[PDB]
Design an enzyme around this catalytic site. Structure first.
Site, mmCIF file in Angstrom:
data_model
loop_
_atom_site.group_PDB
_atom_site.id
_atom_site.type_symbol
_atom_site.label_atom_id
_atom_site.label_comp_id
_atom_site.label_asym_id
_atom_site.label_seq_id
_atom_site.Cartn_x
_atom_site.Cartn_y
_atom_site.Cartn_z
ATOM 1 N N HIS A 46 116.059 107.772 96.012
ATOM 2 C CA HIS A 46 117.247 107.785 96.914
ATOM 3 C C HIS A 46 116.894 108.555 98.202
ATOM 4 O O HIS A 46 117.437 108.216 99.249
ATOM 5 C CB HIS A 46 118.534 108.272 96.175
ATOM 6 C CG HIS A 46 118.794 109.750 96.155
ATOM 7 N ND1 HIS A 46 118.844 110.484 94.980
ATOM 8 C CD2 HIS A 46 119.022 110.639 97.155
ATOM 9 C CE1 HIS A 46 119.067 111.757 95.257
ATOM 10 N NE2 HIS A 46 119.195 111.882 96.596
ATOM 11 N N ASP A 97 116.094 107.025 89.625
ATOM 12 C CA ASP A 97 115.983 107.874 90.841
ATOM 13 C C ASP A 97 114.686 108.670 90.690
ATOM 14 O O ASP A 97 114.710 109.839 90.221
ATOM 15 C CB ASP A 97 117.239 108.722 91.044
ATOM 16 C CG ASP A 97 117.473 109.198 92.480
ATOM 17 O OD1 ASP A 97 116.851 108.629 93.444
ATOM 18 O OD2 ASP A 97 118.290 110.129 92.636
ATOM 19 N N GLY A 196 120.372 118.377 99.901
ATOM 20 C CA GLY A 196 119.053 118.962 100.212
ATOM 21 C C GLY A 196 118.176 119.301 99.008
ATOM 22 O O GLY A 196 116.960 119.512 99.248
ATOM 23 N N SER A 198 117.712 117.294 96.273
ATOM 24 C CA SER A 198 117.343 116.034 95.564
ATOM 25 C C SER A 198 115.821 115.869 95.581
ATOM 26 O O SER A 198 115.176 116.301 96.560
ATOM 27 C CB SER A 198 118.024 114.846 96.130
ATOM 28 O OG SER A 198 119.406 114.894 95.854
HETATM 29 N N1 LIG Z 1 124.436 119.210 91.017
HETATM 30 C C1 LIG Z 1 125.395 118.621 91.743
HETATM 31 N N2 LIG Z 1 126.630 118.830 91.495
HETATM 32 N N3 LIG Z 1 125.110 117.794 92.756
HETATM 33 C C2 LIG Z 1 123.920 117.440 93.208
HETATM 34 O O1 LIG Z 1 122.854 117.524 92.635
HETATM 35 C C3 LIG Z 1 123.964 116.783 94.525
HETATM 36 N N4 LIG Z 1 125.054 116.868 95.301
HETATM 37 C C4 LIG Z 1 125.107 116.210 96.469
HETATM 38 C C5 LIG Z 1 126.388 116.450 97.219
HETATM 39 C C6 LIG Z 1 127.688 116.000 97.013
HETATM 40 C C7 LIG Z 1 128.493 116.613 98.054
HETATM 41 C C8 LIG Z 1 129.851 116.549 98.430
HETATM 42 C C9 LIG Z 1 130.271 117.333 99.540
HETATM 43 C C10 LIG Z 1 129.391 118.170 100.273
HETATM 44 C C11 LIG Z 1 128.054 118.214 99.897
HETATM 45 C C12 LIG Z 1 127.656 117.412 98.806
HETATM 46 O O2 LIG Z 1 126.470 117.321 98.290
HETATM 47 C C13 LIG Z 1 123.978 115.509 96.919
HETATM 48 N N5 LIG Z 1 123.849 114.707 98.038
HETATM 49 C C14 LIG Z 1 124.167 115.090 99.370
HETATM 50 C C15 LIG Z 1 124.310 113.873 100.294
HETATM 51 C C16 LIG Z 1 122.963 113.356 100.863
HETATM 52 C C17 LIG Z 1 122.209 112.479 99.858
HETATM 53 C C18 LIG Z 1 122.043 113.188 98.515
HETATM 54 C C19 LIG Z 1 123.373 113.335 97.783
HETATM 55 N N6 LIG Z 1 122.909 115.434 96.130
HETATM 56 C C20 LIG Z 1 122.886 116.049 94.936
HETATM 57 N N7 LIG Z 1 121.819 116.003 94.119
#
Ligand SMILES: N=C(N)NC(=O)c1nc(-c2cc3ccccc3o2)c(N2CCCCCC2)nc1N
Length: 245
Positions: A46, A97, A196, A198
């Site tokens: 991704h 992924d 950030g 990922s």
């Molecule tokens: N452990 C978790 N709960 N989440 C995670 O691992 C994760 N979260 C988000 C996430 C959701 C979100 C919503 C509002 C503000 C910031 C946010 O970041 C995230 N993005 C960020 C967007 C760009 C592409 C990658 C997807 N990647 C994750 N891997």
């Protein structure tokens, strides 16, 4: 990373910082990853799917800071960018992924292990720790969902592996989480991966050894109650990993 602590690359010496050249020659941070052999970093598909041209990318090993150089760091071009054929994106969930970057320097070398640069082991096939096992995650991802900027300094925190059965509860992720994924969270939902982070490592001690159990993939929000981090389950992808390396 939400919560946890600052660290230095010496505490996750396999951690790979991945960046992208803009047309014009500005460089922005993309994703983490993990050195699994001297020529190979593993990340999340991704991360690259929107800009899949390998010439765009830059990989650093032995780096503790986002926009400053770290004594000992090594800079790499991507000689190969291998995305998983069966990748898909729905509302929330990435499937398959997983990505492989074969790194090579301008002077045509792979990683040279050092105090700041080491490989991490893959797990044995379909072998993961029990639910409630404590694993570490690492990245330059946001400190708060609302933050504009990424931290300058690498972070790590601790999450607890959540049972497949508990992650599939409707008020968690329902069917969005398959057997090729893992969930991990804080009992208090107060620390987590975020935008950030990922492609970065979920590391567990398995047969008492530091083992790459997970790759940060997705989650709803960050550090939200009943919203764990979702990880690519490396132990269901060894044939793919072996076959493409
Ligand atoms: N452990 C978790 N709960 N989440 C995670 O691992 C994760 N979260 C988000 C996430 C959701 C979100 C919503 C509002 C503000 C910031 C946010 O970041 C995230 N993005 C960020 C967007 C760009 C592409 C990658 C997807 N990647 C994750 N891997």
């Amino acid at each position: 990373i939400i919560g946890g602590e600052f660290t230095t690359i010496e505490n996750q010496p396999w951690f790979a910082a991945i960046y992208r050249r803009h047309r014009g020659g500005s460089v922005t941070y993309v994703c983490g990853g993990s050195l699994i052999s001297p020529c190979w970093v593993i990340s999340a598909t991704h991360c690259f799917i929107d800009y899949p041209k390998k010439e765009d990318y830059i990989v650093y090993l032995g780096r503790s800071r986002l926009n400053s150089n770290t004594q000992g760091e090594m800079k790499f071009e991507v000689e190969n960018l291998i995305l998983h054929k069966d990748y898909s994106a729905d509302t929330l969930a990435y499937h398959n992924d997983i990505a492989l970057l074969k790194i090579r320097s301008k002077e045509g070398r792979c990683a040279q292990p050092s105090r700041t640069i080491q490989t991490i082991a893959l797990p044995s096939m379909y072998n993961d720790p029990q639910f409630g096992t404590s694993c570490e995650i690492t990245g330059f991802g946001k400190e708060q969902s609302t933050d504009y900027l990424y931290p300058e300094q690498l972070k790590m925190t601790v999450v607890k592996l959540i049972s497949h059965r508990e992650c599939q509860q409707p008020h968690y992720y329902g069917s969005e989480v398959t057997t090729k994924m893992l969930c991990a969270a804080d009992p208090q939902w107060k620390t987590d991966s975020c935008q950030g982070d990922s492609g970065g490592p979920l590391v567990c001690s398995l047969q008492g050894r530091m083992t790459l159990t997970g790759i940060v993939s997705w989650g709803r929000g960050c550090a939200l109650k009943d919203k764990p981090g979702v990880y690519t389950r490396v132990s269901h992808f060894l044939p793919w990993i072996r076959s493409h390396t």
